[PDB]
Write a protein that binds this DNA or RNA. Structure first.
Ligand SMILES: [Mg+2]
Ligand SMILES: [Mg+2]
Ligand SMILES: [Mg+2]
Ligand SMILES: [Mg+2]
Ligand SMILES: [Mg+2]
Ligand SMILES: [Mg+2]
Ligand SMILES: [Mg+2]
Ligand SMILES: [Mg+2]
Ligand SMILES: [Mg+2]
Lengths: 144, 182, 95, 220, 60, 25
RNA sequence: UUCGGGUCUUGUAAUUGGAAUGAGUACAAUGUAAAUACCUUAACGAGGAACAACUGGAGGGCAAGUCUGGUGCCAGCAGCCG
RNA sequence: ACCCACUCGGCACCUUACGAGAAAUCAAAGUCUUUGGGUUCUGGGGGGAGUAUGGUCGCAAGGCUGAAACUUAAAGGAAUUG
């Protein structure tokens, strides 16, 4: 009738067929190969600290004309270097060069979000304090 | 290493959180019975869902089956003892027909309101919360005290409360002291 | 005939050396700065420019490598710049 | 309001004369309904709800000529539904013609019992299904008071039907509202298309209402 | 001219927006009182029955 | 481009890489 | 008869009154190996009851603004479309 | 050797939907939400890419097996009006 066998003693080929087909997915292949630990900037890590190397801005795509204020950060856990996004309006000046910054995911499963090219990480905390608390003047940078 | 005691969730937020008709119905039920949050309606709906799950599971089982008899009449007697299920319909098929408003109605809030000793639903809520109503010479500071049929006749203001007969309270005592002094 | 706009608090003039693709340009800013110039808003496909064109460009204080070109002068306001002489006069750019 | 309704159909003439009393006589003999006023006469309380208004465009040499497709569902919440889908220039006219078609296309449904029968039927009789476009809707009976487990459009259709408890399962591009509602309509009208053991005995084939009352038709 | 300042400067609109102070208010009741207020405002004090409920209707 | 000519260009790149490897094998 | 008493009720007003109560303090006593803490309870403890509830959002998905001012493809927003 | 009738097997064909499909259409692409006759192989968005690497076959050409990093909100199918 259908491609799969149906006999009462065909459990083996059904199981191995499903097991061979499961590699067609992306989530299953990533989970079993464990590419997150080996290749991604973080190994299965929601957040990671890093050191700001320099202070760059990156232009947007065609339909959106602007320059999103980014920052190049070298991760401390392993030494990789990644660009990250300083989210809000007047937060670029808040983060100074060569200060510890806690990058987080960008919410799109490790893929570039919106019109910002070649970035995959937000910025949540700088120098131990959070950017959202600075942006509403609830706390101030310790300046150490 | 000590044996844990099992905490368990008692509510379940709906999957579509943003339904206009459902939101309006929830606000209707909150305003009708003075519910503080909409977690109250979720809790009653969760209790009702557990009850319905048990009822449907027992219904699936064959008629005149020891499991069906035993736990079906156990649930029936528990619900009629609570009072939500009227004595007319102790059949386990009207159990599936109960609505969330039915359990809402048996709250100590609404019962104090019905008895009339509290003239408003929010008045009932505050009167319960101020340690005034006692269900059998035992105060209940909890609005969601499910009042059972056998004990509804014993709701009244407590003796320790000024309403049941005692010293008036802070404001009245202070005013009386001020009047006596001046 | 329109009034020519001067620089102010960060913006500076420059000359296009060679125009790259994808809206990119190499511009010599008159501080000895062979900088990269990005074609910008109000400038995408509304006014056209070419090689060896006088240009005005805003800097970025957080990155001095790249800088964003804002306004272009039409080879006659360039002459006015040249007489008033805010830009270095050791360069000949004629037709 | 102002309504004369000169009947142009023999069925309409019989209805206006008051000779057909219940819509069950219309449904039983598979009579063709072409006057919406017949359905208005037989079911005075047919509520409606505009499910969707959709702008549909045709590309001509000058601009894009745009009309509106209205998806109207009519019913009385007592086992009668109709699904009109119309396209028109003005949205109000689209909705009017959509309700008009919906009233023309009223259909009866066979509500049944999930388990034992205690009161009036609360759910469908059997599992049913329909398919329009690529959207296949599967209606499955549910125990009493289980609500209508369905997407909002299908839920509103069942509420207009009078079905109080039912499970649903939809497969395909159920995005498109017209296809989903048409599939659900096919299923709920198929509910009276399933032979069931309680429906086996043969009947006497009562003569058609336009045979016994042919005289009151044929306006002379 | 074409641009009033350095174009790519960060925190520009934030810097130059007029700081308008918060308007002082009476306390807004919270908890069960807020739900009672909402219930009264929507289902016993029906304001604009025409059209939709139109909560927060713009004044025009 | 056609898949045919992309394939042919890939084959020519393999030509160059194969001769390079053979010279250094 | 225009009314209109509001005849019957339900909200809105920095008007205005009397109540009730904890969150806190605290004689005690209970609690505990001893103490906290809880349960009870003296004496205090609410008027802007300042004893002041936040976190996100208001184009769509998705409940809620085509109100006011600011910036004008900047700044920025946006999980996606924008 | 034709003619008439019938039958088996084959490449096929016309009409039709009363069935199926997103449709173009299919007498199988039917007997599939009323889902199970037996069985083999293949696919899980597009690109990177049938590329690199590792095997293996070949004198060579190249064949078989065959990813990821990364990037992207589409790519694509049928049909309708211009
Ligand atoms: Mg560009
Ligand atoms: Mg807020
Ligand atoms: Mg916002
Ligand atoms: Mg806003
Ligand atoms: Mg909305
Ligand atoms: Mg793929
Ligand atoms: Mg390919
Ligand atoms: Mg090889
Ligand atoms: Mg095509």
């Amino acid at each position: 009738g259908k491609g799969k066998p149906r006999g009462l003693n065909s459990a083996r080929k059904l199981r191995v067929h499903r097991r061979n087909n499961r590699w067609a997915e992306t989530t299953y292949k990533k989970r079993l190969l464990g590419t997150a630990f080996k290749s991604s900037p973080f190994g299965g890590s929601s957040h990671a600290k890093g050191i700001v190397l320099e202070k760059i801005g990156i232009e947007s795509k065609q339909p959106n004309s602007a320059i999103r204020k980014c920052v190049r950060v070298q991760l401390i856990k392993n030494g990789k270097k990644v660009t990250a996004f300083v989210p809000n309006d007047g937060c670029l000046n808040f983060v100074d060069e060569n200060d510890e910054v806690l990058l987080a995911g960008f919410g799109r499963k490790g893929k570039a979000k919106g019109d910002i090219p070649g970035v995959r990480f937000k910025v949540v905390k700088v120098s131990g304090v959070s950017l959202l608390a600075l942006w509403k003047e609830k706390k101030e940078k310790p300046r150490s | 290493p000590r044996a844990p005691r099992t905490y368990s969730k008692t509510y379940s937020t709906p999957k579509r959180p943003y339904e206009s008709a459902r939101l309006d119905a929830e606000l209707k039920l909150a305003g009708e019975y003075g519910l503080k949050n909409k977690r109250e309606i979720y809790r009653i709906s969760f209790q009702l869902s557990k009850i319905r799950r048990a009822a449907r599971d027992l219904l699936t089982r064959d008629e005149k089956d020891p499991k069906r008899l035993f736990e079906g009449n156990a649930l029936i007697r528990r619900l009629v003892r609570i009072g939500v299920l009227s004595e007319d319909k102790k059949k386990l098929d009207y159990v599936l027909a109960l609505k969330v408003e039915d359990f809402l109605e048996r709250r100590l809030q609404t019962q104090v309101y019905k008895l009339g000793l509290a003239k408003s639903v929010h008045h009932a809520r505050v009167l319960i919360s101020q340690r005034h109503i006692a269900v059998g010479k035992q105060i209940v500071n909890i609005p969601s005290f499910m009042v059972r049929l056998e004990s509804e006749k014993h709701i009244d203001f407590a003796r320790t409360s000024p309403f049941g007969g005692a010293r008036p309270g802070r404001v009245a005592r202070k005013r009386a002291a001020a009047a006596g002094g001046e | 005939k329109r009034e020519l706009i001067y620089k102010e608090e960060g913006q500076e003039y420059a000359q296009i050396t060679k125009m790259l693709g994808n809206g990119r340009v190499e511009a010599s800013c008159f501080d000895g700065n062979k900088r990269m110039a990005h074609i910008r808003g109000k400038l995408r496909k509304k006014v056209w420019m070419g090689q060896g064109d006088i240009i005005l460009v805003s800097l970025r204080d957080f990155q001095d490598d790249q800088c964003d070109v804002v306004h272009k002068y039409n080879l006659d306001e360039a002459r006015t710049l040249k007489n008033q002489g805010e830009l270095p006069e050791n360069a000949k750019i004629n037709e | 309001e102002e309504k004369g309704w000169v009947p142009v159909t023999k069925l309409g003439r019989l209805v206006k004369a008051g000779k057909i009393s219940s819509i069950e006589e219309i449904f039983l003999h598979s009579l063709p309904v072409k006057e919406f006023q017949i359905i208005d006469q037989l079911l005075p309380n047919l509520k409606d709800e505009v499910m969707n208004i959709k702008p549909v465009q045709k590309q001509t040499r000058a601009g894009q000529r745009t009309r509106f497709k209205a998806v109207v569902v009519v019913g009385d919440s007592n086992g009668h539904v109709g699904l009109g889908i119309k396209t028109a220039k003005e949205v109000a006219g689209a909705i009017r013609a959509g309700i008009i078609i919906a009233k023309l296309s009223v259909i009866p449904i066979r509500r049944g019992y999930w388990g034992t029968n205690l009161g009036q039927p609360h759910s469908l009789a059997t599992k049913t299904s329909g398919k329009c476009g690529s959207v296949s809707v599967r209606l499955i009976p549910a125990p009493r008071g289980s609500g209508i487990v369905a997407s909002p459009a299908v839920k509103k259709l069942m509420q207009l039907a009078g079905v109080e408890d039912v499970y649903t399962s939809s497969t395909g591009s159920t995005r498109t509202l017209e296809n989903t509602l048409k599939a659900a309509f096919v299923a709920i009208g198929n509910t009276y298309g399933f032979l069931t053991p309680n429906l086996w005995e043969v009947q006497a084939l009562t003569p058609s209402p336009m045979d016994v009352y042919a005289d009151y038709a044929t306006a002379s | 001219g074409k641009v009033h300042g350095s174009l790519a400067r960060a925190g520009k609109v934030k810097s130059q927006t007029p700081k308008v102070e918060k308007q002082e208010k009476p306390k807004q009741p919270k908890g069960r009182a807020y739900k009672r207020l909402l219930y009264t405002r929507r289902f016993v004090n029906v304001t604009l029955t025409n059209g939709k409920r139109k909560m927060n209707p713009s004044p025009s | 481009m056609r898949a045919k000519w992309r394939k042919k260009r890939t084959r020519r790149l393999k030509r160059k890489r194969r001769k390079v490897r053979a010279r250094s094998k």
